[PDB]
Amino acid sequence: EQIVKIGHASDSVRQYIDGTATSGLLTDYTESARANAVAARTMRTPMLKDT
Amino acid sequence: VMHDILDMMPDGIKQNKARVILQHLSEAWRCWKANIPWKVPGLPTPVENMILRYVKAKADWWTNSAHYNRERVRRGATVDKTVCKKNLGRLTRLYLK
Amino acid sequence: NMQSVQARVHRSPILWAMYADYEECCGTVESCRKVYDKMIELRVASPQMIMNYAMFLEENEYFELAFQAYEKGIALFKWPGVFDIWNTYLVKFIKRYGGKKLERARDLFEQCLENCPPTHAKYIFLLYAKLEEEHGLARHALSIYNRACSGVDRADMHSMYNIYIKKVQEMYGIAQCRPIFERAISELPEDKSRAMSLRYAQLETTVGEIDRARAIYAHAAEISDPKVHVKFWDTWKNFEVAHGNEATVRDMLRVRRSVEASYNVN
Amino acid sequence: MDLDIVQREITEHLKDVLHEKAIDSVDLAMLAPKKIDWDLKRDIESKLQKLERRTQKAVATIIRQRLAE
Amino acid sequence: KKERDQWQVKELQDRKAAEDKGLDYERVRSLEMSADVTEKLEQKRFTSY
Amino acid sequence: EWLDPGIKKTEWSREEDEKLLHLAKLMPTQWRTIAPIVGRTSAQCLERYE
Amino acid sequence: MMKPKWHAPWKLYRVASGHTGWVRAVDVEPGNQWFASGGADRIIKIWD
Amino acid sequence: QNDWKIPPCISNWKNPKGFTVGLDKRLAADGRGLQQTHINENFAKLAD
Amino acid sequence: ASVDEEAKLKRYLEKQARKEQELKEKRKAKLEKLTAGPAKHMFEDQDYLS
Amino acid sequence: IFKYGLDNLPSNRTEEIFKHYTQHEKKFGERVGIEDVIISKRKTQYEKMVEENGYNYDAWFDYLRLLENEETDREEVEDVYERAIANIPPHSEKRYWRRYIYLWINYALYEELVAKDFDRARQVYKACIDIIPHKTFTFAKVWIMFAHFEIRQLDLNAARKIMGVAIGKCPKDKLFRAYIDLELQL
Amino acid sequence: SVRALTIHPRLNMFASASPDNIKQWKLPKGEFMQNLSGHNAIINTLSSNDDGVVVSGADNGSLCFWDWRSGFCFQKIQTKPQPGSIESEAGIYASCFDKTGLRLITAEADKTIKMYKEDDEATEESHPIVWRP
RNA sequence: AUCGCUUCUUCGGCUUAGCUAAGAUCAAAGUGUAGUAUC
């Protein structure tokens, strides 16, 4: 619930501002979120502290 | 036990199967002496309750006679010797139990 | 005396059909209704004659009388024979009346599905869901799918589950879709329950619930064998080399040799 | 006779809902594409816009009365 | 026997014609049979001592 | 020892190996008692432990 | 049926333990002073 | 009638007909599986 | 038993496999046999022919 | 016979009567008899759901839809809204209130648009805001709708007090935006 | 099986008990009078009282008290057996009343004798029975 | 649109004749008679 709130707020702001002649000063907030999400997806179970 | 089974059942039933309940009784007794836990899984458990009463009732009579014969044997000066081997068998089982 | 030839004769389905056709031609509506209504009373009418009767009243535009002509037909026959009457009744109602009369329309489907045998139940559950989706409220439409996979029975329950999976996902997202995957795996037959296990593992691994994904695969592995289901073991192996480690890769190989031993009694 | 006709209404369900090919991504919309109240909100929207049009007519008098004094 | 066979051939080619169309034919047969034969089927369709 | 059904002749998992080493530290040499808990029996415990 | 006569509830107040087997007799003396009981422990016990 | 569906007796001991009734059923009476074993954690305190 | 049940299941499935072309043909064979109806009789009353 | 039965039987046994009675009317009822029996069947069928679980908000919404389409007498619809509303969620976390809150908004819409008793729609909102656990969460919809309602009564002083205590109890972005958009329109 | 008999101590009348029913009979003919029913256990005791009470004890340990004149049942006591015996052993098989008829003695499969006594403290107004023919 | 004999498969029903100290106990080898296969 917290995640989808923050995401929808940020994406809506992106669609309002972007497409203007002085864009490119803005770090691509929706697409960079996509890029971050696909990078984080590779993950593994850690072993054990005792064994 | 036979009278109790026939009364336990109500009417119109397989009652020749009542003879099979006496087999379960004898097994419940043998398991008691072995100290193996007797538990038939599917049993008509009002039948189980009745068998468990009669097994425990025999176990009481069987231990009480084991005590009584041994007390006689301590006083024993008599030709006990078959009663001795019986009573040694029971007391061996009661110890291991 | 009731001589059988004339005493039977009024049970005349060829002749009642010919009589009804002439009343459509020359009777005008009110006499034609009496003829069909008598044909119902006799129990001579075929389901084709009920549908012909309704189409007559519909073409006249006595639409409300057409609906009761179907209704009376539904009282006449029993399944399978009613099925074409229900198909025509429920679609015909749904078109004109189906928006405003929706409160009445839900009573038709309930009245159908209470009697419906599982194999015919598939299509009628889906038109009920269409009505309740577009006009009705959303939770009621989803509840019909929960009812559909119970009613349809085992050869095609899989189709009802995959609709339910898609439609919950389409509105409430994958996080609310989790319980009905677990119901499916526990309920639809083993060929599809394995397939649903792969489906469910794909969700948990894209969300990153990799510890849940293992228990999905491991719970599916016990009703799979490595001698013919190699595609299941390959996809688990490709998962465990990606998202796993030595301590759980060996756990995979333990259940593999355990499960094959179950089948490989030779 | 169109014995199949029930199938013609449910064709959208039979075609695009009766199966799903794959899923292999997620995004902020897919996590929650509609709010859990979306259909209660839908049933209010016809009535809610009458209130809106009364509000726009009401606020026009509030301005007009302020400038009348 | 001939009359029995005329009913057997009549229904079987009706299956064939529906099958030549490619259809549900047990449903099609269900149309005509259901009025009378459902009355006939109602006739067609421990505790020991 | 060998031929009874339920004698569990399969590989030693993680928790069975955990329990066996935990119990070897707890008991010392009690192996007939250790055998019921791990139910892998007496010989299977001892050869695994060694 | 007709009109139950009212009778007071019955309440318990003894457990006399001392047979070493089932009890299966009681009789009360004419004198009402003592009752006898007989048991599957093959012993008759007379109680006051 | 089902409530009195008495299972047939399968002895570990007697067998006067000499029947073979052997592997699965004879163990199914055995009941060994039901009593699990667990031990007081005092033993860990004693050892260490 | 595992060899026999594997074979028997296979032969059950193989008979069930394509249980329609045979049935539709055997239905077709029966249908056309009945509809062909009268075969020629070719009677033998040779003393009438005499 | 069916109609006689419905009276003396009314709650429990009518469940059988209504299924036959509605089939009966499905022919002969067609204009007036069908819609009467199906709605009255539906009415008692929703009351069964409410006796099972008064927490079934979807049953109350579907029930209130039936009665409004009936154009049921106002006092009966008020009694049904006020029965529905008394089922305050036991969890006191906003995820559970999201369906329950429209059970109040629909009541205020009914009182404003259908009953046209604006002095009673004030009381619906005051009763609503006296029930929300504001120090834990708020529905900005309530404070917004209550504010705009007083603007339709031309009472800016009331509307500002509503939005003012909204920000004072729970300063929330949806409130600020609505209050600012209001003062911009003014 | 008719495991128990009792002759009512001041009427020409006797009762007999089986798992089926407890039946009442008029002597000497032996003609039948209405049954005391619903105590569907293996019964084997009856005691009957000078005041008109009959009591039936059952092999399952349950114990019913009845009014002879009407066959109304107005006590069900379930015996609880003394330590180390609970489930099977609860059963009853003896009963007698003392000669006054104010104490009941029962003998028990739990190897105990138990004795019962009548409550007095506020009974008749709290308990009542109506008419219900 | 009513009609009959037979074969087959297929479902439910369809019996361990006590007890005790498990009643007690653990040699195998070589000589004589009966059964099966070949000339």
Ligand SMILES: O=P(O)(O)O[C@H]1[C@H](OP(=O)(O)O)[C@@H](OP(=O)(O)O)[C@H](OP(=O)(O)O)[C@@H](OP(=O)(O)O)[C@H]1OP(=O)(O)O
């Ligand atoms: O808190 P905010 O950032 O101002 O978000 C609000 C608020 O959302 P919260 O649940 O986070 O408070 C509203 O929710 P409610 O408080 O009214 O429950 C919500 O309204 P809905 O729940 O009806 O969606 C509205 O969204 P909308 O304006 O589309 O109704 C949304 O505003 P944002 O669009 O600015 O996030």
